[PDB]
């Protein structure tokens, strides 16, 4: 691929439609499902995941590719968020008050990412397109940013007083910082307890679909004020009852995963690609 | 009379309806034997009560009897030891409450129109011990009718409820064989069915809300008599094994040869001596008959268990044989050669275009012998027209008629039958009848022919001579239009023309074995056509 | 036309099959389990 | 009409327009109005309803034309709802937590239902396609679903027990089940105080406008969990004063009609085709 | 008309009887003679 | 008791419908032809499944 | 079409209406669009 990546595809308009023929890696596809603890807990029985497997061979997925991966709540969840299956679908339980948590996360899932690591201690870091941010995670992440000038003298803040930093974040389990691009930061970070690297969006992500249980359409995946993309793997549901939620979920598989498309699963499970 | 093949093949599922009730079920004379019988039977009751203080009763059900007496037959006193049993029985059941104090019947059992009562009957005169190979076996008897009697049941408190009336008709309905098992020896007995008929008489029970039940209950079925009697005849008809007709066995106890072997191992040179005997002409006209599965299968002097599964079970070994699976595997390519464009790569073809007929193989090779490439080719694609052959995709009479026509005609005169040597000897002989067999496809007056032995031939229709073998050309004539079986093939028509001048019809008739030109020549005596089919015949050999 | 002589003459080795459903049903029928109306069978005390 | 439904009608795209109708429907139509109870509260005048019919007199609806309806709240009015006029604009108050209840409220009247009984002390149901739901309405409707499977036996739930069922409905007035198409499921639900039918959405019914007061787009009136589609009968205002509400409804009649079209009202008031 | 009960066994209900016939009959006849000829039987005197 | 009004076998059936029709894009034509001249009996059609 | 396209013998006209497989066979042989496409017409109208 790599030495033909860089090639025209030609196709003709009238090409009879047709089925791959070619092997894939593995037999069939794998589909995760991630939800909150408290879905489990309402629905209270050992057995649902068995199931609920059964429900979506009846849906036409063979014994084996459904796969249930529980997580405390989005804020937990969001630390290092690990995607398995070859198609990932969230749900995200709906808080009025963690918009921008929510939107983090979706912005993080929903978008390949490539990362490098930032030694704040040694180094002052730029953002040099606006694709570029700055991701933190970790058991609780707060961030002080001082801008510097030309002159490598902080702009509203002493270089070696960080009381003066400006407080972008605190105790975040994952927070995306974007700043005034070109400029030179000094920053410190809670580095005991979360790390932070210098991360560049890709692109969509194509194969995580996140479906929000409850609320309006809140979610914000662009750092651009002017706009607010409500793409095809980002769904809201309305609910009462979790088992209600799941077998809408179970029933529109098709519906859900024809939103989303297969060779986006990294080999790592990872929520970004990253480069020391 | 290939179809019988054919139909063997066809019918081979309903063997697959035959092991599933089998599976659920568990020279030589003919002496008649018609004797008067009289069965006298009687039933067993099983009465378990259940514990406490009485009031209730876990089970009252029927129970095998054995009876024995002598009676009266043509001045003989015989000796009569009979047993009788009850199938398909209604579990009634009475409950008074949950108490331990009411009256409580858990499971009472009641013959009704569905039951079956079973009968075997045995006695030591001669019928019943020639009756070890049978050919037809009837029994006729008077019905008899079995009143159900009075019964108390033991109540230490108030009311003793009784258990009166119920009856039923016994109508005889079959008989088969059967054997009961003594201590050191075992008994073949005559089983007689009776089905039920519900009668006037109708049974309840006291001090229950039990009234109008119809039916005869486990509890006293016999009504104090000693014995029920039904008086009739029974036909039997017994091979006894004889060699010599002024001698007949008083008894038919003797071992016969599948008695102590269950792979015809010597059976062979029996038929292979059969051989000999075969008519020509007589041979092709059997050949043309449809042998079908009854005029296949009714002319054979079978015994009683012989006849009722000689169809099923040489369709059971027919299924199984090299045929039947080289008819699979033809079937399975033809389905997987339509079913995807995308492993014409995988099948090579030694045609214009690819089909199953036209695919060549393993053919692990012969290294004895010089062989070209194209005799290769040509016995892998003859290989598979004998499936045409058995794919009704001919057009004159094929070497199948020939073999099927052989196996008729030695089936019938050989002696030695029973219900394992038909199968593998039917199936046996369809696998190994006529090895190395020709086929010819006629196209544009010239004649391709191949044959399984590798031996291939161009040639014209008007005139006898060879022709430069086209393969890939002989491929694409043979994969759809009709293939003939080369009876009279081509070294046989030469020396006939050279010798014998044949004209143009009849030419034309033997390149399409048409079976009116073969038995003309074959009533000229002509030793040309003569030869041909003693070969074929001889090769007929199992 | 005149198939269905033939066929009728050809099928006939199912008489046979026919024949052992028939005879080894009777052997081998289960006991028929007959069932009690919702109301039942309640009497008496035992009464002397 | 039957003879010619299905025959096609042939038009030039040259035909001139006829004049305004709006006229001519508003004599010739009737329009109900659905407020809750808060409303008339809020007013606290015993003539405003002669004041509305007064004003939409003023647009061009003749006197006994305009019809006000009240219902006590969302909940309440979701038992049974009865659309009676030709034009139906039903002023929903917006609440944060009956999002479902008012998604249900809208699915149910937005769009035109054909209900069968269902017997589920007899008979296992399933639902065929997307467009089968269950609908269930009354006092206190609470549904628990055991799915079975081949062989009817359940999973994860056993026919014999309730209590293993997996409730999906507790205390609605109007709840709509949708549960995996293809299987069998065995229902307990509370036929007392419930009845419940098997319904196949038809299409729209464009006679009915849904005015959601306060709040954002939370309406969701389609079971699959990747559209949630605003069509024009679903509008959208912010309000301090239920008059100010009556009168922007009275002003803008000629565009909330415009955006419905008449001849969808059935013979009964009902909110769904009943056949037995 | 098909008495259900009936059609149960009607097929082979007519071929028990059918395979007992005089047609069946000749039918067997004629194959064993058929055979009997291919093998070199001595047939029977005045056969001609 | 309780009786399944609607049969199991329809969303299987369904399924199969599905994986059938997506199949009869990839026949050949020669070959099919070839096995439509076959006698398709019995055994030949139930033997190879 | 074909006769129109593909103008074809007395003997290939003969046994097309006639259905003969073997002109069938020879023509989708020779990859015919016209027999080509009405074999596929009919193959994907073989649908369940
Ligand atoms: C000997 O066998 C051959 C063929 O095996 C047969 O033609 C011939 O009639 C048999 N007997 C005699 C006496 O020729
Ligand atoms: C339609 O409008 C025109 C323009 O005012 C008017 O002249 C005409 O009478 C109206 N009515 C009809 C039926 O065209
Ligand atoms: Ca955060
Ligand atoms: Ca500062
Ligand atoms: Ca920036
Ligand atoms: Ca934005
Ligand atoms: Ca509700
Ligand atoms: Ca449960
Ligand atoms: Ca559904
Ligand atoms: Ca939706």
Same mark, same amino acid.
């Given at each position: 691929?790599?030495?033909?990546?860089?090639?025209?595809?030609?196709?003709?308009?009238?090409?009879?439609?047709?089925?791959?023929?070619?092997?894939?890696?593995?037999?069939?596809?794998?589909?995760?499902?991630?939800?909150?603890?408290?879905?489990?807990?309402?629905?209270?029985?050992?057995?649902?995941?068995?199931?609920?497997?059964?429900?979506?061979?009846?849906?036409?997925?063979?014994?084996?590719?459904?796969?249930?991966?529980?997580?405390?709540?989005?804020?937990?969840?969001?630390?290092?968020?690990?995607?398995?299956?070859?198609?990932?679908?969230?749900?995200?339980?709906?808080?009025?008050?963690?918009?921008?948590?929510?939107?983090?996360?979706?912005?993080?899932?929903?978008?390949?990412?490539?990362?490098?690591?930032?030694?704040?201690?040694?180094?002052?870091?730029?953002?040099?397109?606006?694709?570029?941010?700055?991701?933190?995670?970790?058991?609780?992440?707060?961030?002080?940013?001082?801008?510097?000038?030309?002159?490598?003298?902080?702009?509203?803040?002493?270089?070696?007083?960080?009381?003066?930093?400006?407080?972008?974040?605190?105790?975040?389990?994952?927070?995306?910082?974007?700043?005034?691009?070109?400029?030179?930061?000094?920053?410190?970070?809670?580095?005991?307890?979360?790390?932070?690297?210098?991360?560049?969006?890709?692109?969509?992500?194509?194969?995580?679909?996140?479906?929000?249980?409850?609320?309006?359409?809140?979610?914000?995946?662009?750092?651009?004020?002017?706009?607010?993309?409500?793409?095809?793997?980002?769904?809201?549901?309305?609910?009462?009852?979790?088992?209600?939620?799941?077998?809408?979920?179970?029933?529109?598989?098709?519906?859900?995963?024809?939103?989303?498309?297969?060779?986006?699963?990294?080999?790592?499970?990872?929520?970004?690609?990253?480069?020391? | 009379?290939?179809?019988?093949?054919?139909?063997?093949?066809?019918?081979?599922?309903?063997?697959?309806?035959?092991?599933?009730?089998?599976?659920?079920?568990?020279?030589?004379?003919?002496?008649?034997?018609?004797?008067?019988?009289?069965?006298?039977?009687?039933?067993?009751?099983?009465?378990?009560?259940?514990?406490?203080?009485?009031?209730?009763?876990?089970?009252?059900?029927?129970?095998?009897?054995?009876?024995?007496?002598?009676?009266?037959?043509?001045?003989?006193?015989?000796?009569?030891?009979?047993?009788?049993?009850?199938?398909?029985?209604?579990?009634?059941?009475?409950?008074?409450?949950?108490?331990?104090?009411?009256?409580?019947?858990?499971?009472?059992?009641?013959?009704?129109?569905?039951?079956?009562?079973?009968?075997?009957?045995?006695?030591?005169?001669?019928?019943?011990?020639?009756?070890?190979?049978?050919?037809?076996?009837?029994?006729?008897?008077?019905?008899?009718?079995?009143?159900?009697?009075?019964?108390?049941?033991?109540?230490?408190?108030?009311?003793?409820?009784?258990?009166?009336?119920?009856?039923?008709?016994?109508?005889?309905?079959?008989?088969?064989?059967?054997?009961?098992?003594?201590?050191?020896?075992?008994?073949?007995?005559?089983?007689?069915?009776?089905?039920?008929?519900?009668?006037?008489?109708?049974?309840?029970?006291?001090?229950?809300?039990?009234?109008?039940?119809?039916?005869?209950?486990?509890?006293?079925?016999?009504?104090?008599?000693?014995?029920?009697?039904?008086?009739?005849?029974?036909?039997?008809?017994?091979?006894?094994?004889?060699?010599?007709?002024?001698?007949?066995?008083?008894?038919?106890?003797?071992?016969?040869?599948?008695?102590?072997?269950?792979?015809?191992?010597?059976?062979?040179?029996?038929?292979?001596?059969?051989?000999?005997?075969?008519?020509?002409?007589?041979?092709?006209?059997?050949?043309?008959?449809?042998?079908?599965?009854?005029?296949?299968?009714?002319?054979?002097?079978?015994?009683?268990?012989?006849?009722?599964?000689?169809?099923?079970?040489?369709?059971?070994?027919?299924?199984?044989?090299?045929?039947?699976?080289? =008819? $699979? !595997?033809?079937?399975?390519?033809? %389905?997987?050669?339509? @079913? &995807? *464009? /995308?492993?014409?790569? +995988?099948?090579? #073809?030694?045609?214009?275009?690819?089909?199953?007929?036209?695919? =060549? $193989? !393993?053919?692990?090779?012969?290294? %004895?012998?010089?062989? @070209? &490439? *194209? /005799?290769?080719?040509? +016995?892998?694609? #003859?290989?598979?027209?004998?499936?045409?052959?058995?794919?009704?995709?001919?057009?004159?009479?094929?070497?199948?008629?020939?073999?099927?026509?052989?196996?008729?005609?030695?089936?019938?005169?050989?002696?030695?039958?029973?219900?394992?040597?038909?199968?593998?000897?039917?199936?046996?002989?369809?696998?190994?009848?006529?090895?190395?067999?020709?086929?010819?496809?006629?196209?544009?007056?010239?004649?391709?022919?191949?044959?399984?032995?590798?031996?291939?031939?161009?040639?014209?229709?008007?005139?006898?001579?060879?022709?430069?073998?086209?393969?890939?050309?002989?491929?694409?004539?043979?994969?759809?239009?009709?293939?003939?079986?080369?009876?009279?093939?081509?070294?046989?028509?030469?020396?006939?023309?050279?010798?014998?001048?044949?004209?143009?019809?009849?030419?034309?008739?033997?390149?399409?074995?048409?079976?009116?030109?073969?038995?003309?020549?074959?009533?000229?005596?002509?030793?040309?056509?003569?030869?041909?089919?003693?070969?074929?015949?001889?090769?007929?050999?199992? | 036309?005149?198939?269905?002589?033939?066929?009728?003459?050809?099928?006939?080795?199912?008489?046979?099959?026919?024949?052992?459903?028939?005879?080894?049903?009777?052997?081998?029928?289960?006991?028929?389990?007959?069932?009690?109306?919702?109301?039942?069978?309640?009497?008496?005390?035992?009464?002397?």
């Amino acid at each position: 691929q790599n030495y033909g990546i860089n090639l025209p595809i030609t196709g003709s308009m009238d090409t009879a439609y047709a089925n791959s023929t070619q092997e894939e890696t593995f037999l069939t596809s794998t589909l995760c499902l991630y939800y909150p603890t408290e879905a489990a807990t309402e629905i209270n029985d050992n057995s649902w995941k068995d199931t609920l497997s059964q429900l979506f061979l009846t849906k036409g997925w063979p014994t084996g590719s459904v796969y249930f991966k529980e997580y405390t709540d989005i804020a937990s969840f969001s630390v290092d968020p690990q995607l398995y299956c070859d198609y990932n679908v969230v749900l995200m339980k709906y808080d009025a008050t963690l918009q921008l948590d929510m939107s983090e996360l979706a912005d993080l899932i929903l978008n390949e990412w490539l990362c490098n690591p930032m030694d704040i201690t040694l180094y002052y870091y730029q953002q040099t397109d606006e694709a570029n941010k700055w991701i933190s995670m970790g058991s609780s992440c707060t961030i002080k940013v001082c801008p510097l000038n030309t002159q490598t003298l902080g702009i509203g803040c002493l270089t070696t007083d960080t009381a003066t930093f400006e407080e972008v974040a605190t105790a975040e389990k994952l927070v995306i910082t974007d700043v005034v691009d070109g400029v030179n930061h000094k920053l410190d970070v809670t580095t005991a307890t979360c790390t932070i690297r210098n991360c560049k969006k890709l692109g969509p992500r194509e194969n995580v679909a996140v479906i929000q249980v409850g609320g309006s359409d809140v979610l914000d995946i662009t750092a651009d004020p002017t706009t607010a993309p409500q793409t095809e793997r980002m769904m809201r549901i309305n609910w009462k009852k979790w088992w209600q939620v799941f077998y809408t979920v179970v029933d529109y598989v098709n519906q859900i995963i024809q939103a989303m498309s297969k060779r986006s699963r990294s080999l790592n499970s990872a929520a970004f690609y990253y480069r020391i | 009379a290939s179809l019988i093949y054919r139909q063997l093949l066809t019918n081979s599922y309903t063997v697959d309806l035959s092991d599933e009730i089998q599976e659920i079920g568990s020279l030589w004379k003919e002496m008649q034997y018609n004797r008067d019988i009289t069965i006298r039977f009687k039933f067993a009751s099983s009465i378990v009560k259940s514990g406490g203080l009485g009031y209730k009763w876990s089970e009252i059900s029927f129970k095998p009897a054995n009876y024995q007496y002598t009676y009266t037959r043509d001045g003989e006193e015989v000796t009569a030891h009979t047993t009788c049993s009850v199938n398909g029985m209604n579990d009634f059941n009475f409950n008074g409450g949950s108490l331990p104090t009411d009256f409580v019947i858990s499971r009472y059992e009641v013959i009704k129109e569905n039951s079956y009562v079973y009968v075997d009957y045995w006695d030591d005169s001669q019928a019943f011990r020639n009756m070890v190979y049978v050919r037809s076996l009837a029994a006729n008897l008077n019905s008899v009718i079995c009143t159900g009697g009075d019964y108390s049941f033991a109540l230490p408190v108030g009311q003793w409820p009784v258990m009166t009336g119920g009856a039923v008709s016994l109508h005889s309905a079959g008989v088969t064989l059967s054997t009961q098992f003594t201590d050191f020896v075992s008994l073949n007995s005559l089983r007689f069915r009776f089905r039920l008929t519900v009668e006037e008489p109708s049974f309840s029970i006291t001090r229950t809300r039990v009234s109008r039940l119809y039916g005869l209950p486990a509890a006293n079925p016999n009504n104090g008599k000693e014995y029920y009697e039904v008086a009739g005849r029974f036909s039997l008809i017994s091979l006894v094994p004889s060699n010599d007709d002024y001698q007949t066995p008083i008894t038919n106890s003797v071992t016969v040869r599948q008695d102590l072997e269950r792979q015809l191992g010597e059976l062979r040179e029996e038929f292979n001596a059969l051989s000999q005997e075969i008519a020509m002409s007589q041979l092709i006209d059997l050949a043309l008959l449809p042998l079908d599965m009854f005029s296949m299968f009714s002319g054979i002097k079978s015994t009683i268990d012989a006849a009722k599964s000689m169809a099923t079970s040489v369709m059971k070994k027919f299924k199984k044989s090299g045929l039947a699976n080289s =008819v $699979s !595997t033809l079937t399975d390519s033809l %389905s997987d050669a339509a @079913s &995807s *464009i /995308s492993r014409g790569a +995988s099948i090579r #073809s030694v045609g214009s275009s690819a089909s199953a007929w036209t695919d =060549v $193989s !393993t053919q692990i090779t012969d290294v %004895s012998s010089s062989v @070209s &490439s *194209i /005799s290769t080719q040509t +016995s892998t694609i #003859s290989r598979r027209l004998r499936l045409k052959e058995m794919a009704t995709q001919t057009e004159g009479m094929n070497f199948d008629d020939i073999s099927a026509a052989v196996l008729k005609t030695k089936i019938d005169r050989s002696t030695q039958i029973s219900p394992n040597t038909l199968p593998d000897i039917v199936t046996e002989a369809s696998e190994k009848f006529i090895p190395n067999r020709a086929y010819r496809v006629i196209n544009n007056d010239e004649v391709f022919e191949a044959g399984t032995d590798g031996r291939f031939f161009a040639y014209r229709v008007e005139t006898f001579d060879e022709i430069p073998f086209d393969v890939q050309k002989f491929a694409d004539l043979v994969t759809d239009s009709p293939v003939i079986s080369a009876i009279i093939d081509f070294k046989t028509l030469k020396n006939l023309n050279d010798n014998y001048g044949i004209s143009r019809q009849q030419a034309f008739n033997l390149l399409r074995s048409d079976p009116r030109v073969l038995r003309e020549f074959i009533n000229q005596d002509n030793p040309i056509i003569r030869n041909r089919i003693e070969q074929l015949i001889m090769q007929c050999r199992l | 036309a005149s198939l269905i002589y033939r066929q009728l003459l050809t099928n006939s080795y199912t008489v046979d099959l026919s024949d052992e459903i028939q005879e080894i049903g009777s052997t081998k029928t289960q006991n028929v389990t007959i069932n009690l109306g919702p109301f039942a069978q309640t009497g008496y005390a035992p009464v002397n």
